[PDB]
A and B are shown apart, each in its own frame.
Chain A
Amino acid sequence: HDFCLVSKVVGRCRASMPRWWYNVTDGSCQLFVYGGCDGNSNNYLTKEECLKKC
């Protein structure tokens, strides 16, 4: 759930780190901009990593 069924969170930090998240609606992993802090566990360094979990 925490890893696969929560929506993407940028968080308060202001970096732009490209991360992957699983979108249930789409059935796939998609890239988003992560701010660098906080956020949630639906947040992977690669597409491969994301699909494997989700």
Chain B
Amino acid sequence: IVGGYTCEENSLPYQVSLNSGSHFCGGSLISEQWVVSAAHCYKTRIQVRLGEHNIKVLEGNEQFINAAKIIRHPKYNRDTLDNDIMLIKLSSPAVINARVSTISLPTAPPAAGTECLISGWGNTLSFGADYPDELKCLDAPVLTQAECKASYPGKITNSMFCVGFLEGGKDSCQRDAGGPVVCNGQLQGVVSWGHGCAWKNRPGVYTKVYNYVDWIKDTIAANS
């Protein structure tokens, strides 16, 4: 997250880190056994890390659980990034407490101007690299679809929306992919892609979670 702030330590019990070799993507806990992330984060061997604020210090609330099933959207396209969403089923259920808890699936579509919270352990710099131990947060509004398409001509599919600022300086970045965009107490977005990070007229592009609520519910039910 470029241009954000350090998140309060007890405030994002739904944020997860995906770890295989390194911390490589984020995600969101949506039920005791299931996490939502980006299809481009797919790997076969994933440890899901719950209850974290600082990815380098044990605070006492960590639960690190292997991924048993990893299910990319059945119409994911890696060349366009269409349908960039995935589900992970944990090998054991998470234990729900103050620091490990679920984020609600959306019950209405996201509208332009709605204020959201984007979070992750991604790069904090547009110049060079500084990957933070503590989780970062960005307050950002949903942009108009017209602004989104004008920023990325011919690249915005039905699965995608833009959240952030056309002025540069405030955006998600590398290592943030898969992580949450939360608006009105519900998961509306998954961090996906952008041209650079926090560059002028290149807002972040996010997967519109509201389009997949039935897929998520059906997938969970079929893999129970």
Contact = CB atoms under 8 A, between A and B. Distances in A.
B192 A14 contact: yes
B168 to A, nearest CB: 16
A20 to B, nearest CB: 13
A13 B197 CA distance: 10
B15 to A, nearest CB: 15
Size bracket, chain A contacts: 10 to 19
A40 B98 CA distance: 44
Nearest to B172: A14
Contacts, number: 61
Interface residues of B, number: 28
26 contacts: A10-B174, A12-B195, A13-B81, A13-B192, A13-B193, A14-B122, A14-B177, A14-B191, A14-B192, A15-B24, A16-B22, A16-B23, A16-B24, A16-B25, A16-B122, A16-B131, A16-B174, A16-B175, A17-B24, A18-B21, A18-B22, A33-B129, A33-B174, A35-B193, A36-B177, A37-B40
Given A14-B172, A18-B21, 19 more contacts: A12-B81, A13-B40, A13-B193, A14-B174, A14-B191, A14-B193, A14-B197, A15-B177, A16-B23, A16-B123, A16-B131, A16-B174, A18-B22, A33-B123, A33-B129, A33-B175, A35-B177, A36-B40, A37-B193
